[PDB]
Amino acid sequence: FXXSXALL
């Protein structure tokens, strides 16, 4: 969840 892991 929350995108790819780049930002979150």
Numbering used by the authors: 1 to 8
Paper text:
Novo29 is an eight-residue depsipeptide comprising a macrolactone ring and a linear tail. Novo29 kills bacteria by inhibiting bacterial cell-wall synthesis, with no detectable resistance occurring upon serial passaging. We also report the X-ray crystallographic structure of a hydroxyAsn epimer of Novo29 (epi-Novo29), which may provide insights into how Novo29 binds bacterial cell-wall precursors.
The crystallographic phases of the higher-resolution data were determined by molecular replacement using the KI-soaked structure as a search model. The asymmetric unit contains two molecules of epi-Novo29, which exhibit only minor differences in conformation. In the X-ray crystallographic structure, epi-Novo29 adopts an amphiphilic conformation, with the side chains of Phe1, d-Leu2, Leu7, and Leu8 creating a hydrophobic surface and the side chains of d-Lys3, Ser4, and (2R,3S)-hydroxyAsn5, as well as the N-terminal ammonium group, creating a hydrophilic surface. An intramolecular hydrogen bond between the main-chain NH group of Ala6 and the side chain OH group of Ser4 helps enforce this conformation. In the lattice, epi-Novo29 packs so that the hydrophobic surfaces come together, with four sets of epi-Novo29 molecules forming a hydrophobic core. The macrolactone ring of epi-Novo29 adopts a conformation in which the main-chain NH groups of (2R,3S)-hydroxyAsn5, Ala6, Leu7, and Leu8 converge to create a cavity, which binds ordered water and acetate anion. Although epi-Novo29 is much smaller than PSMα3 (8 residues instead of 22 residues) the epi-Novo29 molecules daisy-chain through intermolecular hydrogen bonding to form extended structures that resemble the larger α-helices of PSMα3. In contrast, epi-Novo29 exhibited no MIC activity (>32 μg/mL) against any of the bacteria, thus indicating that the 2R,3R stereochemistry of the hydroxyAsn residue is critical to the antibiotic activity of Novo29. Inversion of the 3S-stereocenter of the (2R,3S)-hydroxyAsn residue of the crystal structure, followed by geometry optimization of only the side chain of the resulting (2R,3R)-hydroxyAsn residue, afforded a crystallographically based molecular model of Novo29. The only difference in structure is that the side-chain amide NH group of the (2R,3R)-hydroxyAsn residue hydrogen bonds to the carbonyl group of Phe1.
